[PDB]
Amino acid sequence: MKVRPTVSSSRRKARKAHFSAPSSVRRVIMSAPLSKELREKYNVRSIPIRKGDEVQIVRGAHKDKEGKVTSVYRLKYVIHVERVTREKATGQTVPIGIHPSNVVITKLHLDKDRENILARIKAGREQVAKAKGK
Amino acid sequence: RELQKRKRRSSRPTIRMPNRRKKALNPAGNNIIAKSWNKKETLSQNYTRFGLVAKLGKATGGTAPGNKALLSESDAVPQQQQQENHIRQHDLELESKPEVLRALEREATRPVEKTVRHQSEREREWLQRLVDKHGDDVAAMARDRKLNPYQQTASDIKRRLKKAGLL
Amino acid sequence: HFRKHWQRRVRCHFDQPGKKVTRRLARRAKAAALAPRPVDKLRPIVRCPTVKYNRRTRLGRGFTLEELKAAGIPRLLAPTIGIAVDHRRKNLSEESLAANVQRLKDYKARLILFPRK
Amino acid sequence: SEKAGHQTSAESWGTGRAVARIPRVSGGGTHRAGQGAFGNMCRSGRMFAPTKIWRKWHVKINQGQKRFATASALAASAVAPLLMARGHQVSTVPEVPLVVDSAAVAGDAVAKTAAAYKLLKAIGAGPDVEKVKKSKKLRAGKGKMRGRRHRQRRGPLIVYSPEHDGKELVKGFRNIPGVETCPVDALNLLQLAPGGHLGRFIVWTSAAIKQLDAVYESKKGFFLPANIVSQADLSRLINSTEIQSVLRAPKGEARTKRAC
RNA sequence: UUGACCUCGGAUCAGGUAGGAGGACCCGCUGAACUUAAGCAUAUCAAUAAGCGGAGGAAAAGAAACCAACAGGGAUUGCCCUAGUAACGGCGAGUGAAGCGGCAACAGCUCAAAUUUGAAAGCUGGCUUCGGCCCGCGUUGUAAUUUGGAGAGGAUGCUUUGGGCGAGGCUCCUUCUGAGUUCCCUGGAACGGGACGCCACAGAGGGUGAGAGCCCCGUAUAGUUGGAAGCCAAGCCUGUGUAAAGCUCCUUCGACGAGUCGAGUAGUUUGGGAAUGCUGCUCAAAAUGGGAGGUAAAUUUCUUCUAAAGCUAAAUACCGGCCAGAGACCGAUAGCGCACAAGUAGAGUGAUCGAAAGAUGAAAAGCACUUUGAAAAGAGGGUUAAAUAGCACGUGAAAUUGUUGAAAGGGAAGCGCUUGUGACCAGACUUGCGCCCGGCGGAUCAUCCGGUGUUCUCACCGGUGCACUCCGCCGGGCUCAGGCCAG
RNA sequence: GGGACCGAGGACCGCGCUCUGCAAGGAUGCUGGCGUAAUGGUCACCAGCGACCCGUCUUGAAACACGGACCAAGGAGUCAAGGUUUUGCGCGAGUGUUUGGGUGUAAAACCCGCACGCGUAAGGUGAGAGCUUCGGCGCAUCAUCGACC
RNA sequence: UGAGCCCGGGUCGAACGGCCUCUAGUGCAGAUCUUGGUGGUAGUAGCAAAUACUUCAAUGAGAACUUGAAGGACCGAAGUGGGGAAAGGUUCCAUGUGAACAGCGGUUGGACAUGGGUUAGUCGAUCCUAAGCCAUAGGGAAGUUCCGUUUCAAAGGGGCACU
RNA sequence: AAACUUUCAACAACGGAUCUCUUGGUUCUGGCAUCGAUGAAGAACGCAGCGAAAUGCGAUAAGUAAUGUGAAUUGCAGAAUUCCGUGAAUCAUCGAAUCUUUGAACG
Predict the structure, then answer these.
(1) Is D162 helix (H, G, I), strand (E, B) or coil?
(2) SS3 call for D50
(3) Quick one: which of A30, B119, B123, C10 has the fewest CB in 10 Å?
(4) CA at D35, C1' at G37: how many angstroms apart?
């Protein structure tokens, strides 16, 4: 149950914020979970998705199929996974809009910024685990 | 209303005001009250733990059960069983229990330094000249015009001499 | 009794709990500022004026000059140590004088002073 | 809004025109021109008796009657059939006025939520908690649009002592659905008789019982009421020896034969 | 001849400031009528609406020329009662306070009247190497001291301090912090059902292809990363001048606001001709003075305050400003006129008036290709769970209309009662129970023994029972009861 | 002797008689066909009989007059203050917490100081409900004579 | 009995209901009611006068009102002619379309769409003042502002000089 | 018999009711006090590769500087980013600027 007066339980305001969020807030929203191997490798549950990530689609009509992210289309809250496409009437292939909450990350695109993000998430998680343990 | 519609229609962001207040709601600092204050408790509860009176007036309602913070004459003069024309003006000659109260008592009764005012250099040479020409006769020192141009009284001169150390 | 426009002059107290919370937060703001000190000043005991209410006493505005002098509390120090002063009131009676000096003696006995700096 | 329906300039056309004697909007270059206004039967018009903020939303109730109702709710909660009638699953629980040990309720050992759930399971509130949890579902109507999305049943009410049990059991609880907490020195009728129905399942503590006696002694201007009857068992009252001995002989049977 | 002072001017001189907007609330000015009542007139609406001027985050008011008559209270503001009382009203319509009392919040001060006269000690500029240099204002008075429940001056003896750094802290923004996408079924898609788990100071809310605590954002508490400005502040550097301050005593003093009070008069206003206040005109003050009350008390005794100069936070108001959180509210003819490129399209010379209009689909996957057609489109074909969703798009009523099916109809139709014809339908029944035989096949026949439970005499298990006793099936026979219409 | 319509009730009880039983406080027995659109029902039409177009308004009543092209949606005794009658509830010579204050899981709930609002600080004669130890006691209230202010 | 309640079949796609209390913007045939939609009348009234049209050929799917040629009529310099002022504002020109408008139609159009088009020392404005108006000096007015226009305004130019 | 008028049904039309939804309104509560000659409120004209309106901006014109974040924008077209980097973005913050004609509007 909410306690802090700053947060609001208003459905109207929550939906307005979600559907009028800017691109950075949309990135944070389109964060996606990591695989189990990455989970015990980095002590991180979820990370924002990006263009170079390899993901596994595990929800929707595409049962258990893998592929590299092609584009994170922040405008309609979808990502494009390589080779997950449907043919139009003309026979031209168009990518299928898939959701980061429906995908799971298998291989992670690594750079200094994302290494820092992983380090911060891990540091917080381990600090709280140590505080709870002792 | 038109301004609100304009804001909701424009792409400029909403200037969200942080919830700042003019006055703080809890004691702060490195003092006893600040270190012993509980912010999840109320004023009366904090003062009851401290052993202090918060309100010196009449009770405007029912308090909590544990609340302790809301308080021969020959001449036949009524003020005879009250005694213990000049009084001290800058302080009062005042004469099992909570830890905060005991700590406050110790800080209040803790000895303090005074920082005794000095006599200026020229005042010292002036007094020195007075005693060098007269010695200890403060009446002559006061009646002297060359060395005492301000015509200060003998009692004042004697007091300044005692403070200077020249008797 | 509605010959005037009470509709445009009508007021509702829907913020009674809000104002109660605001006033309580103001009293805590005063006690956060004046933390070891009481959040009020010592007020004298005064007899109510008319024949209807002269059998009872209440709290007055401030203590009189000569009753402060009899209590032994200097004038320029009383408002500083937290005693309200009323230069308009006259005692006119040893009964009021004695009651207020006894009250000030009780305040003296229960007061703690800190030595300047 | 007090300005609703009155932000227009309309005047009746007259009497002899073959149109309704209703105010009509002036103008002449829009759909709104010539249309009725200022009436409760007209589109985009004022409503009959517009709502006002001075509706007397609150009800003043005598504090003596409030205390009477609270006492009656406590007696009903003590009664066992009334819990079942109110809809509480109390069949694996003994001693309907449950008293759970304050040494087992006070501190972190209940401040942990899993521990509070384990205590409820051990004492027998598990059926009620599971009933609430399975009973959660969506509301029918506009409350979903107005912030009342779901609704569920109400579980046990936990009465404790802030000065003996220590107020942290609320945080240990406060997340189990349906389960509510309350201090003994301030009991709430909305919690004691939810929806106006008596017999809520309550778990107490020993300090709660002590302080319940203490607070009902400490109420000022109120004493525990005396009932207008002394024995509520009408079966014993009637079939007692005195009544039946002074009683007259029966004048007939329950179902009497018809003669003609 | 020259030089000062006074007064009045110039400058695109040096440096500043006002105008307008907003006006929800606030301070003033100005100022109605509709309405109600009454022979009539005053009154009421209303000291309101409209108009004009002026501020702020609040404004305004405010530290008694007050209230009282008591044992007195003690600046202002607001709430509760006082009270629909006093009071004024053809004692009509009616109008209509305040003292006391309970509470919220409380805070007190600055001048003018005195000579610094052993010392204009005061201040604006603009030139600066930032240290002090000049120009000036000002004696027709700028500092210090004092402001009448006071004060000054002397004497006297105690008691009082001033600056500059400043770790750190508080407030607010930010970084980070729990747990299933395990298995089966339906489904286009599980967020649905079932199974087994987990987290919970977090089961608020939202998104995700259908109802998700554990997929994602967030949500709870403690911390933690960096930043912002305000205030407090442990300590540390210094301090100075015969500098300032409080009190005490007294063979010395003690200045308090004028075209203002007041008197007459006119208008306006108030519950208020001791005029309730205000304004205009005429006259025009006082110093043991002046103002307001008390009082038959024997004379105007007594009581209580100092007006005509000024400042001041808080409790108070708020349809406007920057936000935030909520609701037993409304749900596209509703809710603001406006859920939409709405104060828009449009109308009026103009002041102004002022609408209608939301929804494909999870995803455009918004129909490739073939054929007819001048084309618009149609027909195949295709996407989709669905085209009985084709951007004339969720669902898709009635009024009204077309086609097909059946029927009726010699100057109205429609409606009630009762048949008949044709079409189309809901029920009811499908056998149940109990005895006589045989075949069986099994397990809980009676009684007794132990344990347990209970209504303390009833049961339940386990043993005993060994199958002319129980319990189910089959192949037969008979009884009773079974639907509709009738004799 | 012939015909028509009806069969309410559901162990026994009662009144009776013509009493091994009965026509006596309400129908049973025997039998047949069918067991399905057969009975029954709903629609449409025919047939015999019946049958002014609704509302408003006026009047003693009619007539006149007025409104009515059809459909969907909207649409009209509400809220507040002050009085007053009755019903329910709590306390009761008292009653009213919610001005305000104290807690709070925080517009909820719980608690309360001093005021304040409104109210409060003796019989006789005869009946009489209800009790009685059947000798009489005597509610409320009424009529009269009373007593007091 | 009734207001109504329940089920089946078809359509549809995301929430809804029974029971006990609470609450109200709670129940329609009328109000010459409001908004919207839809009928009969009804393919009915009606689509004017300016005398007048005809043949061939061309474009086009389609030609009475689109064009070329030929006839037959008309405005008759006080024009049915050629240019302007005011107002409008791209209507001008070329190409394309035929959804809507042009009381019929259209290949046509002042329609819709896409491009293009207005060149000045000598033409007009730009300069001057006319009737009249505004500011300034003053003076009214509670004030927004009013009177006032040469007024009892220190109001405008120019020159000379061995410094 | 057909046609026509009327009744009922099936399907198809007209129309947009019902149900469901809602980045909207309405009411209440809470923290805070900030327009303008350093040129406001308002009006106008310009600015995008392809834009009319809305929105943003002002010839530095759907914007520049700085800080933070950390890999986009999106209808199309063209460039990016080396990703082990002073760095994408119709991103956010925001302390520096640019800021056409008017409008209290001021040669």
Answers:
(1) coil
(2) coil
(3) C10
(4) 17
